[PDB]
Write a protein that binds this ligand. Structure first.
Ligand SMILES: *[C@@H]1O[C@H](CO)[C@@H](O[C@@H]2O[C@H](CO)[C@@H](O)[C@H](O)[C@H]2NC(C)=O)[C@H](O)[C@H]1NC(C)=O
Ligand SMILES: *[C@@H]1O[C@H](CO)[C@@H](O[C@@H]2O[C@H](CO)[C@@H](O)[C@H](O)[C@H]2NC(C)=O)[C@H](O)[C@H]1NC(C)=O
Ligand SMILES: *[C@@H]1O[C@H](CO)[C@@H](O)[C@H](O)[C@H]1NC(C)=O
Ligand SMILES: *[C@@H]1O[C@H](CO)[C@@H](O)[C@H](O)[C@H]1NC(C)=O
Ligand SMILES: *[C@@H]1O[C@H](CO)[C@@H](O)[C@H](O)[C@H]1NC(C)=O
Ligand SMILES: *[C@@H]1O[C@H](CO)[C@@H](O)[C@H](O)[C@H]1NC(C)=O
Lengths: 277, 49, 370, 129, 38, 50
């Protein structure tokens, strides 16, 4: 049916417009050379995800911590030496010295022997510039932004079953599409769970992704990339760029025995060969 | 317009906000020292009476 | 280097596994050998006849020494006029590899990379503050070390078991010193943080739209592979003659030569296929490409003229496209990837430990005196 | 160019409301101290030392209301400190770049004795400029 | 210069001052209730 | 640590504006393919029309 129904039944010549490429169309007619990298992709609703400011390993990285304990033990030992020369801060020296990093503890008796006050002042100045560097790291967190992707690709465990995870979701394609044939040649259960999750209009499925009437949708890559690039509101950025996808292109189907194929292929390579494409 | 886009470089834009702020200001602690000298004058006023 | 040492060796990798998949699909035997030179093949003049010829893989294919080329075939218009192509298994463009990997803020600019105003400034500031506190305290309208410790504690903001002296007029001095100390450390924290946020200069090229490469010099040494198809693609285009004249002076044999040259800073840029440079960026962590993508082309199979290994071979390629064997090729090679206080606060703790040793020495001298 | 605008350009009238709330909290502290040992006039220095919390030992008030006012005032001071750090960050990022000469008819261009460095400028010879 | 060139802590203070002032005014009444309690 | 993250968040909410809340590019395909909301116009019988 369609353009294949016009070219195979010899009521047409070729399809200059965009067309998917699979093995059966390569059997019945002959494609041209491709000219644009157009695989498949998945468009989702993609609400505002988290930036994940959870962990931090930049200042100490679980190895400067030993130096912290060594200098705590040094300050404690010299405080014991001041106590021997000259007040319960033998084992409380670590509690005092890391408590006054965050400057809101109960002030234990500090000796007037000039030693402990100076070393606590040096470590506390180091703690002031350390908290300055920590706030600087938290400020440098603003530079990057990354909301996490829900689905990596076509081989996702979410794509096995939405009942396997605690939120159930939905995924759709276009009816009577070559992507449906690619699903049925790869995963029949994907087609079975897609059958109850069908749709009619591509722009209607886009609005359903906007208004929350659809969770996921599967279509060609660059068409969704362009429709998200022109998207009013600008809330759609596609996950990946064709990495876990079909990775096909757009060709020109000609009849099996058409003499125009060489000239069309040379003209396409000329249109690529100057940057005019 | 195409020729003036081609034959004119445009990397260095107008007033970039790059690294050239070199962590030193001079007028900031100068003004803080002006308020500090005012505090010296007020301390002398409280000292004489 | 070596004219007459030809050895049977072991070949493997990406396209070798692709050929093994093709031999698994179609029933045939084969013979794998390597090309004599290290070139793709260019329409280049021979020394007589005023006629250009071919070399490389095309020079060994058209001479009848080869039958089928499985290689990263740079698809263009010149080769299609002579031989036939295949439908590409790989889709890949062109980009530039540079060295945008230099560590910034080697000590975070605490006291030594920044100039020496702040430390001596706080020093003579607290000196003058201590002198005028002594002038207030000795003539009221221990004492020395107590006022010094109070000055350092208000300057330092940690909380320590001290006490303010009789400050009926010196509490104004103490509150001004407190506001002084906090506005200084707040401005210092704020501009160090906002400095290490905005510490991103531009040392890159940004792809083909660089007028510093449209009118190059000895500063941006960009080159190409000797007798490459990208050189033909830039020789065709009507305004890319300047980059052609720049790259023809430093033509290199293999790409690994350019990799080691840009690794040892012999070059500055290199025009190459995109995903291969992404793979080598996963290999060498000191390599990051640019962003502008151009000449989105394909890698397929170098082929002859009319031959029975054109139709079912293209069917086998598209059969590899439709299943997850492209994902298998990803999982083998393509998808397969590979304020720190170590450079910064090392010297900080070195000066801190030097102050520790000096303070311990001064304390033992004080105990020896008292 | 790194300008200096901290209190007089930015806090032209916010400083007044900060002193108004400071006098309010000090009047509350004096009323609590006079309801139920020297924090009558010293409460002002205590309050503006606990604005910034710069390790100033003063006393520990036995009244619960005084500690509640210190807690609320300290939370106000912490969010004021965070707003001041954000203001300095916005002052760094929004960075203007003024010039020493903003005119072809500059008063510097009449004589370089107008300022302490004698600057220098020229053109190409035999030109329409 | 006559007409073309001629053109014709502020944000972080207003709601903060009003909300903290209202909270302190309510807290003073809470202190009246607590001192009447003891 | 909590109030430091609070200070960083309130600073980050004062660093950036809303970038490109309206389109500035003349070569935008949103301008080439307009909508009912893109009310762009010119003076009647002006040289911009020519
Ligand atoms: C590759 O390079 C040369 C071959 O040209 C090998 O080195 C020797 O070369 C001489 C001729 O100049 C031969 O007679 C020797 O037999 C070669 N040595 C050996 C041990 O074969 C070299 O070994 C080759 N291998 C490398 C380094 O890749
Ligand atoms: C501007 O033009 C004048 C006139 O040609 C140049 O003056 C000459 O300068 C040379 C020295 O460079 C003298 O020897 C000649 O006597 C001058 N006049 C003559 C008769 O040529 C002057 O150099 C030019 N300035 C520039 C560089 O633009
Ligand atoms: C798909 O094909 C079937 C063939 O009967 C048709 O009934 C159905 O309406 C088609 N759906 C669409 C809109 O693609
Ligand atoms: C495949 O080729 C081999 C070698 O010629 C032969 O023995 C075998 O029968 C062939 N199998 C098929 C499927 O034709
Ligand atoms: C033949 O031509 C090449 C240039 O194409 C030149 O470098 C070489 O010296 C010439 N001489 C030979 C090998 O006959
Ligand atoms: C190609 O495939 C067809 C499928 O029917 C087969 O008959 C033929 O022997 C194969 N060989 C050629 C002609 O490449």
């Amino acid at each position: 049916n369609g353009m294949i129904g016009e070219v195979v039944y010899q009521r047409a010549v070729m399809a200059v417009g965009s067309l998917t490429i699979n093995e059966e169309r390569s059997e019945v007619v002959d494609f041209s050379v491709p000219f644009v990298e157009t695989g498949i992709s998945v468009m989702v609703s993609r609400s505002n995800g988290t930036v994940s400011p959870s962990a931090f390993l930049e200042p100490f990285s679980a190895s400067v911590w030993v130096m912290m304990f060594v200098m705590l033990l040094i300050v404690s030992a010299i405080a014991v030496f001041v106590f021997e020369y000259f007040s319960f801060t033998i084992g409380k020296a670590i509690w005092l010295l890391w408590g006054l990093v965050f400057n809101n503890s109960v002030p234990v008796q500090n000796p007037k022997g000039t030693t402990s006050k100076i070393m606590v002042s040096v470590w506390a100045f180091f703690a002031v510039i350390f908290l300055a560097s920590y706030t600087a790291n938290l400020a440098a967190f603003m530079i990057q932004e990354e909301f996490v992707d829900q689905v990596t690709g076509l081989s996702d465990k979410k794509f096995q079953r939405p009942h396997d995870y605690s939120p159930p979701f939905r995924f759709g394609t276009v009816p009577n599409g070559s992507t449906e044939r690619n699903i049925r040649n790869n995963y029949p259960y994907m087609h079975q769970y897609m059958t109850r999750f069908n749709q009619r209009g591509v722009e209607d499925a886009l609005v359903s992704l906007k208004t929350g009437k659809l969770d996921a949708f599967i279509y060609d890559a660059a068409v969704l990339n362009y429709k998200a690039g022109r998207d009013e509101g600008c809330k759609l950025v596609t996950i990946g760029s064709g990495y876990i996808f079909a990775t096909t292109g757009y060709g020109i189907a000609l009849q099996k025995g058409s003499p125009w194929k060489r000239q069309i292929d040379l003209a396409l390579l000329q249109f690529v060969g100057d940057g005019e494409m | 317009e195409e020729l003036e886009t081609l034959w004119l470089t445009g990397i260095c834009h107008n007033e970039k906000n790059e690294v050239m702020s070199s962590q030193l200001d001079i007028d900031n602690m100068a003004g803080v020292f002006y308020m500090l000298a005012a505090a010296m004058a007020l301390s002398l006023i409280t000292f004489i009476w | 280097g070596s004219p007459r040492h030809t050895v049977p060796q072991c070949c493997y990798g990406f396209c070798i596994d692709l050929l093994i998949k093709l031999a698994r699909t179609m029933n045939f035997t084969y013979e794998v050998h390597l090309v004599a030179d290290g070139k793709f093949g260019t329409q280049e003049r021979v020394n007589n006849s005023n006629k250009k010829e071919w070399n490389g893989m095309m020079g060994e294919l058209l001479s009848g020494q080869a039958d089928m080329i499985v290689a990263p075939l740079t698809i263009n218009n010149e080769r299609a006029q002579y031989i036939e192509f295949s439908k590409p298994f790989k889709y890949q463009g062109l980009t530039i590899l540079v060295k945008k990997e230099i560590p910034r803020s080697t000590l975070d600019s605490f006291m030594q990379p920044f100039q020496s105003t702040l430390w001596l400034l706080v020093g003579l500031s607290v000196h003058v503050v201590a002198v005028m506190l002594y002038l207030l305290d000795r003539f009221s309208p221990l004492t020395l070390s107590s006022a010094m410790w109070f000055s350092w504690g208000v300057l330092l903001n940690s909380g320590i078991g001290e006490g303010a002296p009789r400050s009926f007029s010196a509490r104004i001095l103490g509150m001004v010193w407190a506001g002084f100390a906090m506005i200084i450390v707040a401005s210092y924290t704020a501009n160090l943080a906002a400095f290490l946020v905005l510490d991103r200069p531009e040392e890159r090229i940004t792809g083909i739209n660089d007028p510093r490469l449209r009118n190059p010099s000895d500063k941006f040494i960009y080159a190409t592979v000797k007798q490459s198809s990208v050189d033909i693609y830039f020789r065709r285009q009507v305004e890319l003659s300047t980059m052609y004249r720049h790259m023809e002076k430093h033509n290199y044999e293999s790409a690994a030569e350019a990799i080691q040259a840009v690794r040892d800073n012999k070059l500055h840029a290199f025009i190459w296929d995109s995903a291969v440079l992404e793979f080598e960026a996963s290999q060498k962590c000191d390599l990051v490409t640019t962003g502008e993508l151009f000449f989105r082309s394909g890698f397929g199979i170098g082929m002859r003229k009319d031959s029975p290994w054109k139709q079912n071979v293209s069917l086998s390629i598209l059969k590899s496209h439709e299943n997850g064997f492209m994902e298998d090729l990803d999982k083998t090679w393509v998808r397969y990837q590979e304020t720190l206080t170590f450079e910064n606060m090392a010297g900080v703790f070195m000066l801190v430990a030097g102050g520790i040793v000096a303070g311990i020495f001064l304390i033992f001298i004080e105990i020896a005196y008292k």
